[PDB]
């Protein structure tokens, strides 16, 4: 149904709103019937979920019918279809967690090849496209490559990932040096 995107090692808020603006009974679980967290009595409980530590909600917003799921330090394999269950509601949200790295270590050289790689989760259709500090645009799949680097490229690169109609945007600093051999 609803589809949220998120960056690696980042934070995201999955929303789940039921009617009767009040602290009623609820819980979150993933696609594999594993309780992420829920309210037992009035107190927040955390389940056997792999996310046990990095998962939390927001208590004050419970009296407003809101029951948000909050996940910090997002890893990629956290990508999944999360299910919130309230009263007789089944509100589903698919989280997809992308990441972006420069597989060329760092400190590159005029003429060398640069490659940005998109760490995507299993079973995704990402369409990336970036923008150098000049204006030129490159686009591709998991692998976007710059054949041969310039000095004008030394700066901050912006990159747009598009999943479905939603999108996330990374920025990644790259430095380029010059060299000669006489």
């Amino acid at each position, epitope marked *: 149904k609803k589809v949220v995107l998120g960056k690696k090692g980042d934070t995201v808020e999955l929303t789940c709103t039921a009617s009767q603006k009040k602290s009623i009974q609820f819980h979150w*679980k993933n696609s*594999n*019937q*594993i*309780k992420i967290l829920g309210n037992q009595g009035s107190f927040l409980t955390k*389940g*056997p979920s*792999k996310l*046990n*530590d990095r998962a939390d909600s927001r208590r004050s917003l419970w009296d407003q019918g809101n029951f948000p799921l909050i996940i910090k330090n997002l890893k990629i394999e956290d990508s999944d279809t999360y299910i919130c269950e309230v009263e007789d509601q089944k509100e589903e949200v698919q989280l997809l967690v992308f990441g972006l790295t420069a597989n060329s270590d760092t400190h590159l050289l005029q003429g060398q090849s640069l490659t940005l790689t998109l760490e995507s989760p299993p079973g995704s259709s990402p369409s990336v496209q970036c923008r150098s500090p000049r204006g030129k645009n490159i686009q591709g799949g998991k692998t976007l490559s710059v054949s041969q680097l310039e000095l004008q490229d030394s700066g901050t690169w912006t990159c747009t990932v598009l999943q479905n109609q939603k999108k996330v945007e990374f920025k990644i600093d790259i430095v380029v040096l010059a060299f000669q051999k006489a």
Partner: antibody
């Protein structure tokens, strides 16, 4: 106190099919994934596959296509494991078991253990 | 891929002595708070039975002489003092990521 009840032991020739059943009585069948484990004679345990008792979806690690087909009958709280192209390797003891997704128990309840014997 | 390697493959110990069995995971199966590991006991021709759940918690009934410990990639059970009925094969299982694989097992025998 729940409990998992499987089918009796089975004798099949090589190349035949066998369908062993597992029924849960004590909890709500569709609120817990069901896992299957194989233990060949004289060997140790080995995980086989989990089936989602809500969606029907199951993931398993069997060599060769087919041969391992997990299915459900929610209408009678019963999970099935079907082995299609039997072999002398398949001769083993098979267990189904629940995995507590709600609480900090684990494979908390197992099955009696079905004994498939494949030989001519 | 998550491989569990148990050592030793077999253990021989006299009554009243301490039995130590290790289980090493290829990758971490824990998250600060908890560790997703389990120990089973399977006596001669018996079904396996859960002994320790989540690395350090004794199952109901299990005698106090059993204990589990460890975190991350290294885990240990202890049986002290060993008794006659402890003759059995012991396995270890992780519930980190499907497949919930098993260790190779360790057979414990008593020296009289």
């Amino acid at each position: 106190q729940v409990k998992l009840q499987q089918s009796g032991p089975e004798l099949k020739k090589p190349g035949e099919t066998v369908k062993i059943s597992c029924k849960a009585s004590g909890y709500t069948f569709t609120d817990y994934s069901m896992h299957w484990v194989k233990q060949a004679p004289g060997k140790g345990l080995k995980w086989l596959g989990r089936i989602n008792t809500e969606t029907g979806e199951a993931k398993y690690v069997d060599d060769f296509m087919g041969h391992l087909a997990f299915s459900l009958e929610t209408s009678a709280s019963t999970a099935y494991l079907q082995i299609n192209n039997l072999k002398n390797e398949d001769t083993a003891t098979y267990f189904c078991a629940r995995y507590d997704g709600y609480s900090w128990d684990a494979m908390d309840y197992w099955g009696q253990g079905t004994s498939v014997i494949v030989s001519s | 891929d998550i491989m569990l390697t148990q050592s030793p493959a077999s253990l021989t110990v006299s009554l009243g002595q301490r039995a130590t069995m290790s289980c090493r995971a290829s990758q971490s199966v824990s998250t600060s708070r908890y560790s997703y590991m389990h120990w089973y006991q399977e006596k001669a021709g018996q079904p396996p039975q859960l002994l320790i759940k989540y690395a350090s918690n004794l199952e109901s009934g299990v005698p106090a002489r059993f204990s589990g410990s460890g975190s991350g990639t290294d885990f240990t059970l202890n049986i002290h003092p060993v008794e006659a009925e402890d003759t059995a094969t012991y396995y270890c299982q992780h519930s980190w990521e499907i497949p919930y694989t098993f260790g190779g097992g360790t057979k414990l025998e008593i020296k009289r």
